[PDB]
Design a protein around this ligand. Sequence first.
Ligand SMILES: Nc1nc2c(ncn2[C@@H]2O[C@H](COP(=O)(O)OP(=O)(O)OP(=O)(O)O)[C@@H](O)[C@H]2O)c(=O)[nH]1
Ligand SMILES: Nc1nc2c(ncn2[C@@H]2O[C@H](COP(=O)(O)OP(=O)(O)OP(=O)(O)O)[C@@H](O)[C@H]2O)c(=O)[nH]1
Ligand SMILES: Nc1nc2c(ncn2[C@@H]2O[C@H](COP(=O)(O)OP(=O)(O)OP(O)(O)=S)[C@@H](O)[C@H]2O)c(=O)[nH]1
Ligand SMILES: Nc1nc2c(ncn2[C@@H]2O[C@H](COP(=O)(O)OP(=O)(O)OP(O)(O)=S)[C@@H](O)[C@H]2O)c(=O)[nH]1
Lengths: 422, 422, 426, 426
Amino acid sequence: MRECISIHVGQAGVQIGNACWELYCLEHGIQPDGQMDSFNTFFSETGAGKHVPRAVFVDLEPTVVDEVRTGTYRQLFHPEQLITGKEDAANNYARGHYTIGKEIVDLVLDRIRKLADQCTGLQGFLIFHSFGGGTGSGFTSLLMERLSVDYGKKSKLEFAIYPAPQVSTAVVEPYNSILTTHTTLEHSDCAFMVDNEAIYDICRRNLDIERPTYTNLNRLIGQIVSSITASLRFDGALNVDLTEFQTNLVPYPRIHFPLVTYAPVISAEKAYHEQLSVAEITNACFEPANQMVKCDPRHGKYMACCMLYRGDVVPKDVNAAIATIKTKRTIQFVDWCPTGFKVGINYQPPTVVPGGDLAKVQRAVCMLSNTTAIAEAWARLDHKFDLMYAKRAFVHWYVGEGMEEGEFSEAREDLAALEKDY
Amino acid sequence: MRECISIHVGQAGVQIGNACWELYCLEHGIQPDGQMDSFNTFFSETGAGKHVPRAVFVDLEPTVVDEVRTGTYRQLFHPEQLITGKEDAANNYARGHYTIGKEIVDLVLDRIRKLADQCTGLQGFLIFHSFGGGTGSGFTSLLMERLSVDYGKKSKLEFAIYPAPQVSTAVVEPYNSILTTHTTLEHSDCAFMVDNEAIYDICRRNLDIERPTYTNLNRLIGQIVSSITASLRFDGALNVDLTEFQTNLVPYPRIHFPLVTYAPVISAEKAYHEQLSVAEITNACFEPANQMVKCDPRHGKYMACCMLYRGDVVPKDVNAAIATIKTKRTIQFVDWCPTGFKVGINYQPPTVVPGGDLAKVQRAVCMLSNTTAIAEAWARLDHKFDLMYAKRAFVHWYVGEGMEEGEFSEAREDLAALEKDY
Amino acid sequence: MREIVHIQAGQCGNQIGAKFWEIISDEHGIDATGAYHGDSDLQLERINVYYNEASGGKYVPRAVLVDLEPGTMDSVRSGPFGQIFRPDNFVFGQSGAGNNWAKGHYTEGAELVDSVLDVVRKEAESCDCLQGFQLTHSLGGGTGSGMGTLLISKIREEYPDRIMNTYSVVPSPKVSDTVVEPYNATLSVHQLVENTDETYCIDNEALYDICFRTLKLTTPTYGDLNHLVSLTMSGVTTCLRFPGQLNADLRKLAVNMVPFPRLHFFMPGFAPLTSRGSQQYRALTVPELTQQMFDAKNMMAACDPRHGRYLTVAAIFRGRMSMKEVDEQMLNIQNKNSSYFVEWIPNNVKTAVCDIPPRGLKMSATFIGNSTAIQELFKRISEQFTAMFRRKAFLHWYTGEGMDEMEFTEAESNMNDLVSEYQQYQ
Amino acid sequence: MREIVHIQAGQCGNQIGAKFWEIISDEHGIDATGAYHGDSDLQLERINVYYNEASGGKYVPRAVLVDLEPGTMDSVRSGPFGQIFRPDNFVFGQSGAGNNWAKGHYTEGAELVDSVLDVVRKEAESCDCLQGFQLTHSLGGGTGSGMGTLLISKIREEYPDRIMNTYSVVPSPKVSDTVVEPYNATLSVHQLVENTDETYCIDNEALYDICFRTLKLTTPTYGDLNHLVSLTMSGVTTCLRFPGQLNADLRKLAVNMVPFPRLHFFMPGFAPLTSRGSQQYRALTVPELTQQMFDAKNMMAACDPRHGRYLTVAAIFRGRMSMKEVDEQMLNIQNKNSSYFVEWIPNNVKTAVCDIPPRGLKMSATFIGNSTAIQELFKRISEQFTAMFRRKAFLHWYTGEGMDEMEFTEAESNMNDLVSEYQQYQ
Ligand SMILES: Nc1nc2c(ncn2[C@@H]2O[C@H](COP(=O)(O)OP(=O)(O)OP(=O)(O)O)[C@@H](O)[C@H]2O)c(=O)[nH]1
Ligand SMILES: Nc1nc2c(ncn2[C@@H]2O[C@H](COP(=O)(O)OP(=O)(O)OP(=O)(O)O)[C@@H](O)[C@H]2O)c(=O)[nH]1
Ligand SMILES: Nc1nc2c(ncn2[C@@H]2O[C@H](COP(=O)(O)OP(=O)(O)OP(O)(O)=S)[C@@H](O)[C@H]2O)c(=O)[nH]1
Ligand SMILES: Nc1nc2c(ncn2[C@@H]2O[C@H](COP(=O)(O)OP(=O)(O)OP(O)(O)=S)[C@@H](O)[C@H]2O)c(=O)[nH]1
């Protein structure tokens, strides 16, 4: 009925989608084969007892997609939703937007069209990608504008792996980030920033894991998305719709980059000594270091807040904790938004994956905040562009793919305007 | 009772006939010996429990007919139906029309006459041949004028293998194609185009077969013919007669070249995780690339469409899907034909040949449409004629068989008139 | 059923025909005597196309051997498979033209012509239906070219319907084997242009190049070259003699490859041709043959097609193919090699497939190309003829035997007309 | 699927390529012949990148061998893994440039160029998609540098889309192996800067230093040196050939490590490199490798990076790492070594990890560095060229072969411009 269509672009998107789909299949008891009501919101039941996710995997290189084809979930995904290319963008937004994307965007467009034709209550689209990767910027932006012009006001959500100010695999990340942000600002309804270094720190200090691989990061991201989607996939005291997210956390269309936070992130041995309360988890979540974006919110302000509690939490307890923290002077809120809160209570306890770093607990909270600290990073990011543009470094690479030198300056001034809009 | 007469001309006709009759014999459970009520429409039970097809195989070269004599279905035919020539036309319409056909058409005429004398409810004739082949053009044309003058208004159906613009075995295909199209235009009640490269593509990237042989092409063609004839050979909610096709899909007698499409075209590997409904199969069929004729219908318009759904499909579902697609803007219909739809529901599931690429499924759709884009190809074909006639290339070959140079020019202008009729 | 008469002239023609007969017998599984020893019914299904039944369950080839000296035919009789031929078929003179066209066409041929026409008429009428004639000779020698021209003239005035092809061996440009070879070439061409439906040009130097480089053999012999030409011939005829998923015959090739009545000279080519070691390092696939298919190194005709243009191309394959791949391969060849292909013949590539592969090879192909490269060859002969005619060198032999200077003038005029037409259609 | 063509020139190039092929066959589990014997499906998952499936469960490398003398290729044929190569792929000359660039590029290369371009086009078109070309040669010799320059020119004018990397061996500054090596180096560099996307500088003296000191071996051999260079090459390509938690390919390295079209020279580095007894005294951890990658001792370029500055750094790793630790380690490198790193390139370190470790080592790392130290090398060469040009020493050999003094002047001017650009960007 109320289906949602997932898109994964780039290697990061593919890995995150794999983790998310295994997590949901475990949550609904779906076998890797696909066997065993809200599951219809994400998995179509075809023929007899067989179920297939409404997912599309696309990349300009066949490595990760082929690995997914060889994964245990091969019996889950129907073969042709997976898309493979020949030449990767190679950390080049122009390569992934003009060279290869311009002739393979139609394939993913047809895939999502045939998926949407068999769904009647499509709430919106989810996209997972990375700014640093050339594919995850260029092809993401391209398919995003295709979806926007094919749908207009249909809600779309973006999960961008925002490269860290110091952890950035591609040395040309500022160019791709600026270009793709200029390209995606107008039509991406709501993009969520995620910092890899922040996740590393949170995992190492709270979960007390010395050496976590990307598997743990993918577990955390899948848990976040599961907490987000539990409203549609499960009943609750106050269910929240996807349209409400862009209705609440968008004071103005320009500023639509809210960050996310999770609580609690503890090991089982820690979980023995800790009993869960709404107040403790909420104040821990509002603690700046618990956020997976490397920015101090207290350096800015707060424009909106959205708590998502899952489990058995009394609404009076949530109201009391939220009011008490609102009374606290630690966090400042913008004057023209005195009432910028939203609370979603759900009766589904968070799912635990076997071998997972997270420990199964009754209560859990996912927080979404549109703070002002984000612009800070943007400014720094813009500064990086300057340090890589005064010498015109790497310009020839993007010039060779069909760019125009003026577009770089246009994107730079556009993002300067976005920054000073705060 | 309500019999139909099959005719196969040339090697293409012989192979297609072999595949189609083995498919029918499988459908009715007919042994290769011919043993084991609607079967009376194609097989004449004679003597004792022995049924023989009402098929005539004719060729100017005795290769394929002899191969049929040595085939597994040797005892299926009483050996008098198979006809052999001595010298093939060798990709020469003049050779197959004037040299050898003029003195051997009488044999097949007598064969079909005595086959028709023992049938009282003869619906019409199915004819299989290829335009490129000299036999499949010349002998088909000659036999077809003989049938037209011996029967007048009796319905005739043509299954022509329209040579592709670039996949064409004989280099002299344009001359034969133009000549035979001019010669059979007047009598062609309803002729179906089939472009081999289109079947190659449809097999390769839908059935995922890397290296298909004409066996699979013949399987698909036999499936198409079985879907067409299931109305006569089986009951359904809305059965369709052969006269109804030439009644519906002929807005004017001149333009009578509808193309065909099939759905679904998949293997069991995809079929495990895919369900079938009328809407999905119908919108997949309406997609231009699924058509086995290399044209884009969006370049032109639609005059008529006839969809045969075989299996267990609810008529209300068919009506809803057809209305929804009618509301879709991607297909445009001519103004003076607002209601050009025909729907035929049959309760017989599509038969699957053992070892066949196609996977057994409950539902299947065969679509026959009259689109304008076909004229495009004709114009292109006519253009090719000019490129092969301005230098008078290969003229001597046809002059040696008794042609007149004026025939080429009159055929060219006739097909120009056909093209500009659109 | 479409029986074919085999006729060979000269030492080269007779040896090549002998090799071809051993190849055909190997293909049909016939012993060294003539008794049937095939493994499948399809081996004997069209056995009558190249054989006639004989009492005792025997088979004799439908062949006629012609010569002006009794030596090379004696060698063929004493050679391998000497008992398969019925001795009555052999016909030879006692003089020997001695590398003179006039002697081989007007003085010493005027007596053997009656016998050879009688025997070919006997073979034609005694059979069911004569599809055509295949000839084997060379244009350099005396009895070869002259006898071939005389036979084609008489056959054409006798059977104006059946198509005949000549596997004439063009003289090698690198060595003038006979000093008078330009004269023989000119006269043979002047007769073949009208009295022969089509011709294949095969050169010894190209065969040597293939054997040294492509086949990587240190010791080439005439046996190997005759084997290659015989393999080409068998691959050409396998479409008629065996069933195929897309069958073809001699008339199909004639119609496809001939855009004009006088433009009927073709380049044959074979693949695969690998040495002893390379055979285990090549994936025996159709792309592996198409990469060996269109290039000047693999053409056994001494003319580079890249200089000229391909008027038309035909490819006959043998084995287990999914020939939609062959179709798209021809499309790719048209695409990338658009420069070498003529423009006013859309889709100038003809393709046919025969089920049964040749013995020893799971899959192979054969190329028949009509192009303007041979023009160069032809053009060259022209001036060489002039270079040997202005000084009137070696004209005494031809003049004394009944020819005339006007005859050579008319032959050269027609030859120049042919080369001019070839150049004009470029 | 992104197939790669391997081309080797000169004795050094051919030997290094042979060693690299044995290393790759070891990595992919290929026997001494070419039969597949892998233990995991991932070995054959991308086997086609460096191999072609011959008939009958066989694989042959996508390799081409080029030389002007038929000796060292004979050694390759007779050496270990000699039967894996396709014999026809071998291409050899018959004269030998004799350490003369003009002979290896104008006189004796002008005839082998046709054959090598033909074979490289064969390999390119016979494959699905050619990602790029990797070459192996040395600039000191004559046939090596000249053939490499000719091949890169022809390929670049033929394929302006596919990136190519050259593993050229820089002449050793410590000894002038050939008196004319500055000239060959200058000409080869002048061709590479325009017709090559990137180059790696490898010097024999650095490998000797590593063998004696870092590896602690009493007797260095060319086999060990080639083994180290091959290990570097395999570590570079393992990102493409094997799945990785953060995948990469040649285009990724090119885009990340090239800030300007003409500043595309790189330094290789490998870790770990320990003697026999040291392996049990150092833990196999990532910090134990990061301490070993960043030092002038482990750079195979005869130039200390500490004098200059690092433009960019790329680090590929293989094995079992929780690479957030690699991230914070790169942060430590950026922090402590801030002086040695350029300032106008924020976060100038690229990082990638491939899952499968190299055979025999549970975890390893490879380093690719673009810095201003190589400038000195180039700078030094300039004076040597001048020191060998004012006296006009050994100009007769190059002048007589068709070159000119203006050609040397233009090459020296381009070299000076390049070194000036490196100095200016410091
Ligand atoms: N947190 C997290 N990030 C990942 C993961 N996998 C990949 N990434 C991110 O992906 C970035 C690399 O860029 P990609 O999008 O993967 O590049 P690509 O997939 O090769 O596509 P191209 O750049 O166009 O070639 C790194 O900076 C990582 O931050 C993952 O599993 N977890
Ligand atoms: N799709 C398809 N086409 C076929 C098949 N068999 C033959 N053809 C077509 O037949 C054409 C070859 O000419 P034919 O129709 O066989 O002509 P013929 O039987 O040789 O008769 P003549 O031309 O007079 O010699 C090719 O262009 C093919 O398109 C088949 O099994 N499937
Ligand atoms: N391919 C091939 N060519 C041959 C062979 N034997 C001879 N030739 C070629 O045939 C040409 C000579 O033709 P030939 O048959 O000897 O003339 P001829 O007229 O018959 O000679 P004569 O009988 O009057 S003595 C030469 O160019 C030679 O290269 C052979 O076994 N294989
Ligand atoms: N690393 C490494 N370097 C080598 C090896 N063999 C030779 N070299 C280096 O190659 C350089 C000489 O290059 P070389 O290939 O001999 O020139 P050439 O032009 O090919 O010489 P020729 O073929 O004309 S005789 C020398 O500096 C030498 O140090 C080797 O096995 N490993």
